[PDB]
Amino acid sequence: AMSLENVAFNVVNKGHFDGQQGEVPVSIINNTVYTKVDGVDVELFENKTTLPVNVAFELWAKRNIKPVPEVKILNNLGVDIAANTVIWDYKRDAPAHISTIGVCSMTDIAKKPTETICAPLTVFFDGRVDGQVDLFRNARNGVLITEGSVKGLQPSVGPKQASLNGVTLIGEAVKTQFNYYKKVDGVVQQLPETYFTQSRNLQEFKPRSQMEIDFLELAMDEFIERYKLEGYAFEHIVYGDFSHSQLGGLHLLIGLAKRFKESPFELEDFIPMDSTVKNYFITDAQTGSSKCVCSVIDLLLDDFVEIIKSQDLSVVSKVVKVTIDYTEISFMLWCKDGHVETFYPKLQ
Amino acid sequence: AMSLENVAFNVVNKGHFDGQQGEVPVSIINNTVYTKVDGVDVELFENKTTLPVNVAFELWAKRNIKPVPEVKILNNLGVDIAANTVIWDYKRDAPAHISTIGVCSMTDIAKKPTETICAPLTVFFDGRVDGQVDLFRNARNGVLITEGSVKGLQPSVGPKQASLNGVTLIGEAVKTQFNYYKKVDGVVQQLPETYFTQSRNLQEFKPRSQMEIDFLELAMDEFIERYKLEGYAFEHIVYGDFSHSQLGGLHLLIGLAKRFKESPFELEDFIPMDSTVKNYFITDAQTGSSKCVCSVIDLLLDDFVEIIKSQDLSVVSKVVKVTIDYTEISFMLWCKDGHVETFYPKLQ
Amino acid sequence: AMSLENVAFNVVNKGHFDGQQGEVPVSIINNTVYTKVDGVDVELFENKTTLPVNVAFELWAKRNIKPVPEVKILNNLGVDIAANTVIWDYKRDAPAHISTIGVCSMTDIAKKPTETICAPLTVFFDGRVDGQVDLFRNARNGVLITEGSVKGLQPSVGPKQASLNGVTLIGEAVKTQFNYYKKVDGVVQQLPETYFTQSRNLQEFKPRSQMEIDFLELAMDEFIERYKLEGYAFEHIVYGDFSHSQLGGLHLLIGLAKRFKESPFELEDFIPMDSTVKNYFITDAQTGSSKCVCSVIDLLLDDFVEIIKSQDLSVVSKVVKVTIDYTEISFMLWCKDGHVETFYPKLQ
Amino acid sequence: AMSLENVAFNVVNKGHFDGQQGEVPVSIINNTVYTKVDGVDVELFENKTTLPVNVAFELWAKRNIKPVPEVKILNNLGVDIAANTVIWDYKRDAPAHISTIGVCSMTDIAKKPTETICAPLTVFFDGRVDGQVDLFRNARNGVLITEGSVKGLQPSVGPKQASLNGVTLIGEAVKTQFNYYKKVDGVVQQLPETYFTQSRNLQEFKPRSQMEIDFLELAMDEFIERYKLEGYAFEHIVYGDFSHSQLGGLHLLIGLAKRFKESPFELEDFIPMDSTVKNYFITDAQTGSSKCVCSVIDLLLDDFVEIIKSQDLSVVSKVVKVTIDYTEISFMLWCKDGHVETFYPKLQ
Amino acid sequence: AMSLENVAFNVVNKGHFDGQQGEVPVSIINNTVYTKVDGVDVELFENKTTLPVNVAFELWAKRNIKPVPEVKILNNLGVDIAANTVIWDYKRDAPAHISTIGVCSMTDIAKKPTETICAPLTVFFDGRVDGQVDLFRNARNGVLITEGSVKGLQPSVGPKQASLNGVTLIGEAVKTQFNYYKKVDGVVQQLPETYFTQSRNLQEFKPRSQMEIDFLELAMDEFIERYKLEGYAFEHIVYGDFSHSQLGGLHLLIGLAKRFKESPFELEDFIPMDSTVKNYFITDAQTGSSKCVCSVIDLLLDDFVEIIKSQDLSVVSKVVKVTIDYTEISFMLWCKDGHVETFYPKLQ
Ligand SMILES: CCc1csc(-c2cnc[nH]2)n1
Ligand SMILES: CCc1csc(-c2cnc[nH]2)n1
C-alpha cells in the first residue's frame, strides 16, 4: 500500500519508513519534498541523487537504520544490490546501489532475491534478518554478514566498525563487527587475509594504539628513534615535507591529523565517495605547499609500520600489493641504497 | 513603486528593504537572484521557499529586522498572518506566514488589516509600530505584542528572549520581553499561565540557574543527591541511558548538552521547523545507542524539576498536560511502586 | 581535443584539468556534473555560476592552481579578462571574469591576447608563464604580475599574500608577493602608493604586529593609554559600542575578532564577493545591538593608526581618501572640538 | 573517442551521429543542448526523457535511421535491448529500451551482445547489419529481423509497414516488411498466427481495401447491407453512437476517421506510447458525447469483419482473445438473442 | 525607471514594451514569467533563450515591432549588435544579438552607439528612426537600412520582404524593401551584386513568376520542355528522385512545395536558425526515400535557372560560388559528358 504521502507520514511521525499507516499532504518542488505543517511547507528531503525526487525520498526513508557495513567494504566485496533493504551512502547522499529487491516499485528489479534476475548480481544479505542466511545459500552470487557462526561456512572477521545512520562507530550498545561471507557463481569464496582502514576523521582523530599515541605526542626525530624507523622515509611518507611547492608525502591520515593540530590545510575531496584510499587536492595554508592528487589511507600506524617493514628495500621501484578492506591496494615502493625514499598508495 | 530591481537596490545598498529609491540590474536563474557588480554576477538570494524566487526575495528583503517573537510562540498563539510586516522563519528559510497584509503585491490578501478578508484570521500586531494597538482593538482575531501597558488590556508577560535577525537573544541594548495579548472572535482571551522554553543551542549551551550549573558540573549520583531527585528517573529522562540498542530517555536539552561535551552524537532534525518540543533521530557516536524519534524540550532544569515533582506518582501511566510557550504539551508519565520510570513529551 | 568527458577524466585522475588524454562517462542533471564510478554516480561539480553547467565545469577544471592575486586586487586594478588562464573566484564560486582567452571554446573571445578584440580590455598577464611579459608589452591594456624585475618597467610591490586554490596565504614554499604593472591605452601607468588589506578571517585571526598583539591582549583603556590613542575614538571605531539598538563603530576586522572571542555575533555578508571594504548586516548575540550596513576593513592596526593620526581633526565632517589595495577608499571623518567622533569607510 | 562536443558536431554536420571526427562548442541549460553558431546559441535537442540531458542527446543522435520495426511490435515480442543500435521511440520522445549494447558508455551494459549480461535479455538483431543473423543464431534470447530468408529457419512475415525516423510507412524505395524470428532459452520459436494493426493516422487516413473504400464512401445502412453485416453492431462498434452523454462504441480507427471528416473531436491520449490498442478520452465537439476510456484499434476493416464474424454469438458476455501484432488482445464480446450488442478491445 | 513589473505592465496593457508607466504583480517560476490576473497566474512569457528569464523577457518585450531585415540578411552582412532596438529572432525564440545598445541594463554594452565600445562592432542602424542615418555616417562599422535615398551614398537595393513580428512578408501597407549601406573601418562599402532568397513556406507556397506558376501547374517532362531545361538535371535537383533509399536532389523549396501538395514528408530542422541555405533530415512518407542532410534553398526558379545555365558544364566536379543574401554560397556542380548530373548548395 505504498504512496508518496504514506512514505512522508512515516518520515514525519516515525523518523523514517516504519510501515505505519497514514498520509500527510506532500508537495514536490523541483528536487525537494515538503509537507504542510500548520499551513506552512516544511522541507522533509532534498534530493542530491540522480534518481527522481520522489523515488530518492522513498529509498532514503526506507534506508537501513541498523549498523551496516561501510560502503567501501561493500564495494570492495563486489556488492551490486541489497536484499530487501537500502544501504544509504551518506558520503554521496544517495543509495549505495542503483536497483533494489523488495523495496520500491520504481527501483525494484525483483520482489525476492530468489528471482532469476538477481542470480548474476552479488546480492547483499543480512544474517540479522530472518531467512537471509538461507537466501545467501540459495544465491548464485552474494555477500553475507552475520553476528555469529553459520554451520559449515568459514567466516571472515570484518572490521570492528560499521555505519549506524551515517555515523561510523565501533559499537558498545550494538554489534558492529560482523562475519563476512562471499559467493561467486554458486561457489563460496575464501575471503583474503586483510588489514582494515580505521575510518577516522581528520578533525576528531583519536589514536587507537600506543604507537599512535606516541606519534601525535613525540617530536618527529624521537618517534622515529623510539620505533626504530630510521631509513623508512616516515619524515616524507607520514609526516609530510612542506618545504617545496609540491607537498611531499603525507599519505597516512594520522600524519595529516598531527599536521592539522599545528596548522590548518584545505583538503579538496574531488571524488566524494567512500573508498579505502582517498584522493585529495591538498593546499597547506601555512607554507603554500600543495599537491593535486594526494592519496591518503587511514591505517593503524602499527599496521602501516608492519607493511613498510615487511618490504624488500633492494630495488629502485616496484609495486607492493597489500590487501586492505578485502581489496588489493597497489603501493609504489621507491628505494635507494637500501633505504626507503617513498611508499605511497599508487595513483591509477 | 515596487520592483524587483528596487528591492535588489535596497538589499545591495541598505542590507535589506528600506524604501529607498533606485534600481540595480538583476538576473534570475532558477531559484537564485543575482546582481551585476562590476561586470560579474553576485548572488543576493537563494530561494529555499515554495514561493516564486522573486516573490520570496521581496518577502525576505521586507523581513522584520526588530526583535520579534520566535515563530514557535506565534504558532502556539495561532497567528495566521502579520500586519504590515514579514516574520521571517530562519529555521525554515521561509516566511513564517503564507500571505501578507500591505507588504508584497503577490502575497497580499489586503493592504490594511481592517479589510474584511483579515477578520477571520489571527493577525499579528506590533505595539511598537504606530496605530497597531488600535488595529488590534478593531481586529476580530489577533495577537498583539507591546513593550508597556495598554489601558484596560490584561497582559501576559512573554519570554525574556526574542529573535533579532535569526539570532535568539535576551536583549540588553533592545527590548526582547513583550506583553502578549490575544483576541478570538472579537473577544480578548486570557492567555494561560505558562512555562517558557529557553531556546538554547546544544553546541553553545549556557546554564541559566545554580541547578543548571550544578547539573553540568556535578556527577550524576551527587547532583541527584544534592537536589533530592531520588526516584524521579533523572538517570533515564535527563541524563540518558546509552547501554541498550535503543537510547533511553534524553528528553531535556541540558542533558543532551552535558553528554555532548564528553562524546558527540548525530541529531537528525527530520522536521526542520521552530517548535516547543523538537523531534530528533539521535545516534550516539560513542556507544551506537540510537532512537528514531527522541523528543527534546529546552526547559530550565528548575522548571522541569518543578513539573515532575508536582505529579502524582501513584498510577502506571497517564497523560500530564503542561502549558509551555502558551501551548498545552502532553507528557507521558510512567510510574511503578511510587517512583517515576519515565516522563517524556508524548509523541503524537 | 576538448570535450566534457576529457575535462571530467582530468578532474577524476589529476585533481583538475592537466591536458591528459582520456574520457570518463559523464551525466549532467540540472546544475550538477556526475561521473559513473563502479556503477554509481559520483558528484564532480555543482554549478553555482550564471554560466551553463558544462561551461562552468570546464572553467573550474581549468582554474589557475598557482598562487594568484586575490580577486579584490584584480578588480581594483581594472582587470577584465585573464590571458590563457581562469582566475577562479572562490568567494563567489564562479570565474572572476566573464570571458576567457585560449581556455574554453564557449567563453573565449580570442585564442591569443594579441587579437584586436582584447586591445580595449585590461588583460591579466602572468610573468611566471613564458612569453607573457612580452604579451603585456604588446597589449594596449593590461595588468602584469612578475616574480622579479622586468628591464625598464618600474614595479609596484604588491601584497605579501596571494590566493592558492582559494586559500589566502603568505607563501613560504611558493612566492606570493608579486611586482605589479598596469597599462592603460598603450601607456604604462604608475601604480599609486598603497596600503594593503591583510585578508584575515574573523574565526582564525592572527596578529601581525606588536600593536595587534597588544590590542587583543590589553584592556581597552590601557591599550589606548600605551599607544597614545586618546581622542581618536578607538572605543567607537575599533572596539565597537554595543550599548544602543544601533551597533556603534566596529569598522576594523581586528576589533570584530577581539569581540568574537568574548561573545559571538552574526555577520550577514549580503553582497558575497571579494572586496577591499566588506559590508555586513551585523547582529550582536549578547546585547542585541545591530547595524544593517557595517563596513569592515582588514587593515594592520598600525596602518589604521597611521591613517587616523595623519588626519586634520579641525572640521566637523570631511571625506578622507586613502589608497588601499590600489583603489581609493573614501572614509568619512567626523570630528568635534579637535577630537575624532567617528571615522568609517564611507558607505556609497 | 566519444564526447558531447563530437556528438554535437555530428548532429550539426551530418544530421545525426555518423562517427565523423570534430567538435562544436556546446552549452547545456537544464534539459536543452545548445551549440554556438556565429556567436549565438542554437537549440540542438530538448530532453523529453527521464535520462540525463547529455545521455539522452547521445542516444537520440545514435538512433537507428533505417526503417525499423514499430516499438509496439518490439514490445509485443518481448524485446529488452537492441544490439549495437538505439531504437528511438518517437511516440515517447525517448529511447525504446533502458540500456544499450555498444552505443553509449553511460547506458551500455555490454559492448557486444555475446557478453553473458545479454544472455537472459531478448536482444533485437537486425539481419541487414553484417553478422547479426549469426549473432542471433548464437544468442540465447532474441528477436531477428531480415529482408530475405535465413538458412533452416522458417520466418514469420511481419507487418508491411516499419518506422523510418518516426514516419510509419510501407516502403517503396526501402524495404519495410521483415521476416521475424524469435528465440527463447536457445530454442527458435514458432511465432503465432497474427493480424497486424495498420498504424494509420486519423487526419491522413487512407483505405487499404475495397471494403475500407466502401466504408468511407457509402452511407451506414448501405455499407452494412452490401457486406451482410446486419446484427453485428457496426452502427455502435465501428460507426459510433453520438446520441447519449456517453459516446457509444467507436473502437475502430476507420470509424473515427469517417467521423472526423464530417465533424472534429478531441482525442486525449492520456498514456502516450506506442501500443496495439490505444486508449483515448474522447469528446465529440458536435454533440458533446464523450467517453473517458475509448479503446481504439487500427485493424483493416476486412480483418475486423473476419474476427467478429468468426465468433459464437450465443452467450451474454465473454472474453475473445485475438492475436494482433504478435500479442494476445482480449476483447469483450456482448451479445443478446444471437446478435452482437458490443465488441471492444477489453479495458484491463 | 526600468523594472520587471513595469516591463510586465507594458506587455499586459500595450502588447509589448511601450515606455508606459505602471506595474503589475509578477511571479517567476523557473523559465516562465507569470502575472496575477484576478487572483490567478497567467503566463506572459516562456524563456527559450540561454539568457536569464527576466532578462530575456525584457528583450522580448523591447523587440522591434516594425518590419525589420530578416536575421539571415543581418548575419550575412556581419551585424553584431543593433542601435537602440532588439532584433528578435523568431526562428530561435531569442534575441538575434548577444548585447544591446540603450535597451536593457543587463545586456547593454553602451547607452549610445557613439561610445568607443561600439566602434569595432558592426552596429545596425535604421534610417526610419531619427538621427540614425547620421549615426551610421559617424560610425566606424555598421549596416544602414533606409526607405529612401541617402545624400552621396549609393544604395544596395535589398530584398522585397522583411520580418514584421516574425511574419516574413512583402509589405503593401508598410515598406519592407530597404536600401542597404555598409561601412567597414570608416569606409563605405560597395555591397556585392546578389540574388535574394524568397523566404517562402512549404505549406503556404506562392509562385512569384510565370516560370514558377508553370513549374507548379505543369508536369515534369513538359515544364523542362517549355523552358529548354533538358540536360540540366532538374528531374534530380528540383523535382527530386524518390526511387532509391537515399532521396535524390530536392534542393529548391519550390520542388519541395510541389511534392508536398501530392504527398507529405518530414523535414527535420536539426539546426533551427535563420539562414540562406537550410539543412533538413528529410523522410518521404510515401516512398520511404530519405536524406540526413538535404540542403534546401528558396530561390526564385528563374534565378536558379539563370545560375545553373551560366555554368560551364565541362568538368566532373567544381565549386560554384554564388552571391545570395549578400553572402557567398558555395554550390557543388557535378557534370558528365556536358550535362549536369547534380548541383547543390555545398554541405561544408
Ligand atoms: C476519412 C475520409 C477519407 C480518407 S480516404 C477516403 C477514400 C478514398 N477512397 C475512398 N474513400 N475517404
Ligand atoms: C504547391 C502547390 C501550389 C501553390 S501555389 C500554386 C499555383 C498558383 N498558381 C499556379 N500555381 N500551386
CSV table of N, CA and C and ligand atoms in Angstrom, one decimal, chain E residues 202-207 209-210 212-218 254 256-262, ligand 2:
chain,number,residue,atom,x,y,z
E,202,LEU,N,6.8,26.1,-47.0
E,202,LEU,CA,6.5,24.9,-47.7
E,202,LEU,C,4.9,24.7,-47.8
E,203,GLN,N,4.2,25.0,-46.7
E,203,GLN,CA,2.8,24.8,-46.6
E,203,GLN,C,2.0,25.8,-47.3
E,204,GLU,N,2.5,27.1,-47.3
E,204,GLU,CA,1.7,28.2,-48.0
E,204,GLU,C,2.6,28.8,-49.1
E,205,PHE,N,3.1,28.0,-50.0
E,205,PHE,CA,4.0,28.5,-51.1
E,205,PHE,C,3.2,29.2,-52.2
E,206,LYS,N,3.7,30.4,-52.6
E,206,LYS,CA,3.0,31.1,-53.6
E,206,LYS,C,4.0,31.4,-54.8
E,207,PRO,N,3.7,31.1,-56.0
E,207,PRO,CA,4.6,31.4,-57.1
E,207,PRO,C,4.8,32.9,-57.4
E,209,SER,N,6.5,34.2,-60.2
E,209,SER,CA,6.8,34.4,-61.6
E,209,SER,C,6.1,33.4,-62.5
E,210,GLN,N,6.0,33.6,-63.8
E,210,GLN,CA,5.3,32.7,-64.7
E,210,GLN,C,6.0,31.4,-64.9
E,212,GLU,N,7.5,29.9,-62.3
E,212,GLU,CA,7.1,29.3,-61.0
E,212,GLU,C,5.7,28.8,-61.1
E,213,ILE,N,4.8,29.5,-61.8
E,213,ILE,CA,3.4,29.2,-62.0
E,213,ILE,C,3.4,27.9,-62.9
E,214,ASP,N,4.2,27.9,-63.9
E,214,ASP,CA,4.3,26.8,-64.9
E,214,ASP,C,5.0,25.5,-64.2
E,215,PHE,N,5.9,25.7,-63.3
E,215,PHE,CA,6.5,24.6,-62.6
E,215,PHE,C,5.5,23.8,-61.7
E,216,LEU,N,4.7,24.6,-61.0
E,216,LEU,CA,3.6,24.0,-60.2
E,216,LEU,C,2.5,23.4,-61.0
E,217,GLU,N,2.1,24.1,-62.1
E,217,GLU,CA,0.9,23.7,-62.9
E,217,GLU,C,1.2,22.6,-63.9
E,218,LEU,N,2.5,22.5,-64.4
E,218,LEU,CA,2.8,21.6,-65.5
E,218,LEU,C,3.4,20.3,-65.0
E,254,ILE,N,10.7,25.3,-54.1
E,254,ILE,CA,9.6,25.2,-54.9
E,254,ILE,C,9.3,23.7,-55.3
E,256,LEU,N,10.1,21.1,-53.3
E,256,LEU,CA,9.6,20.5,-52.1
E,256,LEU,C,8.1,20.9,-51.9
E,257,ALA,N,7.7,22.1,-52.3
E,257,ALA,CA,6.3,22.6,-52.2
E,257,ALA,C,5.5,21.8,-53.2
E,258,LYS,N,6.0,21.5,-54.5
E,258,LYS,CA,5.2,20.8,-55.5
E,258,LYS,C,5.0,19.4,-55.0
E,259,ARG,N,6.0,18.7,-54.4
E,259,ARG,CA,6.0,17.4,-53.8
E,259,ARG,C,5.0,17.3,-52.7
E,260,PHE,N,5.0,18.3,-51.8
E,260,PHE,CA,4.2,18.4,-50.6
E,260,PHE,C,2.7,18.4,-50.9
E,261,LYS,N,2.3,19.0,-52.0
E,261,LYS,CA,0.9,19.1,-52.5
E,261,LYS,C,0.4,17.6,-52.8
E,262,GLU,N,1.2,16.8,-53.3
E,262,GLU,CA,0.9,15.4,-53.6
E,262,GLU,C,1.0,14.5,-52.4
F,2,LIG,C1,2.4,23.9,-54.2
F,2,LIG,C2,1.0,24.0,-54.8
F,2,LIG,C3,0.8,25.4,-55.3
F,2,LIG,C4,0.8,26.6,-54.5
F,2,LIG,S1,0.5,27.8,-55.4
F,2,LIG,C5,0.3,27.1,-56.8
F,2,LIG,C6,-0.1,27.9,-58.1
F,2,LIG,C7,-0.7,29.1,-58.2
F,2,LIG,N1,-0.7,29.4,-59.5
F,2,LIG,C8,-0.2,28.5,-60.2
F,2,LIG,N2,0.3,27.5,-59.4
F,2,LIG,N3,0.4,25.8,-56.7
